[PDB]
Design a protein around this ligand. Structure first.
Ligand SMILES: *[C@@H]1O[C@H](CO)[C@@H](O)[C@H](O)[C@H]1NC(C)=O
Ligand SMILES: *[C@@H]1O[C@H](CO)[C@@H](O)[C@H](O)[C@H]1NC(C)=O
Lengths: 220, 212, 285
């Protein structure tokens, strides 16, 4: 039943504030030292802070010295990270980790909550089809897709014909244009014969903006 | 700041292999070493505490050893569930440190990219900006090179590439280039074409399309 | 008894003798020749029956003992040699010991009483003595008695491997730890520990406390060997100092032995600080 559910993670304007929250369940939170560990999108792991079993002694990275504050609440089964003066560099997924001992290894990690730190406003995505009118010329195979421009923040979920069609689908990892707007694209590669007979919709969902979209892709 | 540094950074191996990863602290850290597995879009998981000890629920094919400033995660008889990034961490002294990670990939025969291209939807062209895509499907290894020519004028620094994690079934990569123009600029020119050098293909393949 | 038939009178220990019957060997083989020609008797494929007759010969010739000469090439007759006989030997050599124990590999009551006669003469159980003894019967050392072990020179402790000290019970390791602690006190730290490590079965509280201060890194296995009585009066501090990072695995042995008692003897408010989640103790204040 062991579950660490981090939350509070969202978008923040630089120099802004934000407080995170790891909800423990299926352990004696009273009797364990926790830490925060963060991971830059597509870089490695970094320790951020750490609270004792008392709440008394608190350690931090020089990176976050006196901008962050680790707190705990054994009553409410919660661990907190206050974060002020946030910069671009603090954008990451923050994992709340449970040590198997004070001065030990982190033996359980949370699914982890994402913090984006940018001035860019929450934009829901424009969606656009990639018609396979001249990808059928591949012979036996025909590639078609849809394309998710001008969106922020991360992430978006793209499934095809309502999660039903799954085999030969490639949702590519998002980039980020000069606009400072992330830009994604998903394709799926299918027999040429099916085109027209079988209808193909891609289903975009952008939780940040509430924007979700079903878009159909057809050659002619 | 104790510097941890791993070797290698990237390692391709086949299933049922004995793979050795290295970790090397800048300073003595006795036995205060740990190992962490991470598979993409998921949280890290504990393998090893105290340089040697297995965490619980972890296969025994996982064997940590070492002390002082030299350590060795060794995965005997590799499984498919073991192809992942591996992270060594010191908890001798604050600040706590992980290494770079070690992307452990599946190994296999080469594969030519299947290559496609996609003019802009007139849906997009109404709004303004106008974006051509070039899809490389299943290939090996990752190193391909998309290169956009428009009316035989190499376009530089106006296309963002992007690549899948190695597949589960085909253990193979795919790629997407995204040549962004203006409405006007798209209107102005005729032939578009991504030229695609890869090891698998003998000569640079170049799929092409003309406006209308 | 009887006289030897014509011709059968053995002038040399040849192969022919394997064909002579029990009684023919009794009569025809000169005892004095057997002693001087003892080197050859190994090769000659005699039966057990036939050897009983060759044993009893030499018994007559030396009814007070046995020259090291005979003892050297005694061959396969060691097994037939009753412990009583051996209790009165002047062996005084390592190569003859080796010789006798090689065939002994091919308890054993004879083996025991022989070894006791080599040391009983040699005066002390020396390094090189115990080196070759364990090369045939490693658990020898942990086969001996608490009292017996006192005679061992501390210098000899060096010859011991960890292998030996698996069959060793407490009341033995008691007598063994002191000696090692003298043999290994010309050392410190990353040196001292490797050596002393096996013997900590004997080690009392006071001696464990000192080790903590020397920033030694112990494991849970080694800890589970420490005397129950010697664990009880250690702080949560001194436990976490010994075990260092291996403390993580201590949760597992909560309801075991050395630490079971320790946990109960400690306040809940003390344990909590270990970040392990151990239960049992005094909730004070
Ligand atoms: C053994 O050696 C001692 C010391 O010289 C000697 O006195 C004794 O007679 C010897 N015993 C036998 C049985 O030969
Ligand atoms: C033991 O470690 C401590 C740090 O906690 C430090 O005083 C020194 O490095 C070591 N001291 C001794 C006596 O080994």
């Amino acid at each position: 039943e062991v579950q660490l559910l981090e939350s509070g993670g969202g978008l923040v304007q630089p120099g802004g504030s934000l407080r995170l929250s790891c909800a423990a369940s299926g352990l004696t939170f009273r009797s364990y030292a926790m830490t925060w560990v963060r991971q830059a999108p597509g870089k490695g792991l970094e320790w951020v802070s750490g609270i004792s079993v008392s709440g008394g002694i608190t350690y931090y990275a020089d990176s976050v010295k006196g901008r962050f504050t680790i707190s705990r609440d054994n009553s409410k089964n919660t661990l907190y990270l206050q974060m002020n003066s946030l910069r671009a560099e603090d954008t990451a997924v923050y994992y709340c980790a449970k040590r198997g001992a004070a001065v030990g290894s982190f033996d359980y990690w949370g699914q982890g909550t994402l913090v984006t730190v940018s001035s860019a406003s929450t934009k829901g995505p424009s969606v656009f089809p990639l018609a396979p009118s001249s990808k059928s010329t591949s012979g036996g195979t025909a590639a078609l897709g849809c394309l998710v421009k001008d969106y922020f923040p991360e992430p978006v979920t793209v499934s095809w014909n309502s999660g039903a069609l799954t085999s030969g689908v490639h949702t590519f990892p998002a980039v980020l244009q000069s606009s400072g707007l992330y830009s994604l694209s998903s394709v799926v590669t299918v027999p040429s014969s099916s085109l027209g007979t079988q209808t193909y919709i891609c289903n975009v969902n952008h939780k940040p903006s509430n924007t979700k979209v079903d878009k159909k892709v057809e050659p002619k | 700041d104790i510097q941890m540094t791993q070797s290698p950074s990237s390692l391709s191996a086949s299933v049922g292999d004995r793979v050795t990863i290295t970790c090397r602290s800048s300073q003595g850290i006795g036995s205060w070493l740990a190992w962490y597995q991470q598979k993409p879009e998921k949280a890290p998981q504990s393998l090893i505490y105290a340089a040697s000890s297995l965490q619980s629920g972890v296969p025994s094919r996982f064997s940590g050893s070492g002390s002082g400033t030299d350590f060795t995660l060794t995965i005997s008889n590799l499984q498919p569930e073991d192809f992942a990034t591996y992270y060594c961490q010191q908890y001798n002294s604050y600040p706590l440190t992980f290494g770079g990670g070690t992307k452990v990939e599946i190994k296999r025969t080469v594969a030519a990219p299947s290559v496609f291209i996609f003019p802009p939807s007139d849906e997009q062209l109404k709004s303004g900006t106008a974006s051509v895509v070039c899809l490389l499907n299943n290939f090996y290894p990752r190193e391909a090179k998309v290169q956009w020519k428009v009316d035989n004028a190499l376009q530089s620094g106006n296309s963002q590439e992007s690549v899948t994690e190695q597949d589960s079934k085909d253990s193979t990569y795919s790629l997407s280039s995204t040549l962004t123009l203006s409405k006007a600029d798209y209107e102005k020119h005729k032939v578009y074409a991504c030229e695609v050098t890869h090891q698998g293909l003998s000569s640079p393949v170049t799929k092409s399309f003309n406006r209308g | 008894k009887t006289a030897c038939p014509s011709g059968k009178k053995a002038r040399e220990i040849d192969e022919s003798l394997i064909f002579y019957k029990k009684w023919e060997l009794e009569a025809c083989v000169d005892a004095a020749l057997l002693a001087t020609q003892m080197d050859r008797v190994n090769a000659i494929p005699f039966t057990y029956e036939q050897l009983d007759v060759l044993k009893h010969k030499l018994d007559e010739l030396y009814p007070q003992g046995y020259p090291e000469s005979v003892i050297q090439h005694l061959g396969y007759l060691f097994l037939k040699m009753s412990p009583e006989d051996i209790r009165k030997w002047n062996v005084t050599s390592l190569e003859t010991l080796k010789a006798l124990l090689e065939v002994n590999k091919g308890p054993l009551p004879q083996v025991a009483t022989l070894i006791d006669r080599f040391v009983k003469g040699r005066g002390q159980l020396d390094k090189d003595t115990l080196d070759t003894l364990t090369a045939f019967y490693p658990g020898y050392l942990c086969s001996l008695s608490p009292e017996e072990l006192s005679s061992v020179p501390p210098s000899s402790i060096w010859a011991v491997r960890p292998q030996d000290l698996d069959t060793c019970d407490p009341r033995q390791l008691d007598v063994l730890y002191p000696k090692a602690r003298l043999a290994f006190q010309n050392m410190n730290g990353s040196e001292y520990f490797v050596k002393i490590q096996s013997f900590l079965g004997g080690a009392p509280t006071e001696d464990l406390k000192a080790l903590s201060q020397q920033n030694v890194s112990m494991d849970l296995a080694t800890f589970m060997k420490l005397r129950t009585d010697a664990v009880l009066p250690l702080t949560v501090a001194e436990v976490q100092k010994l075990l260092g990072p291996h403390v993580e695995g201590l949760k597992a042995e909560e309801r075991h032995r050395p630490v079971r008692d320790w946990i109960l003897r400690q306040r809940q408010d003390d344990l909590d600080t270990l970040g392990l989640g151990l239960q049992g103790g005094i909730p004070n204040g």
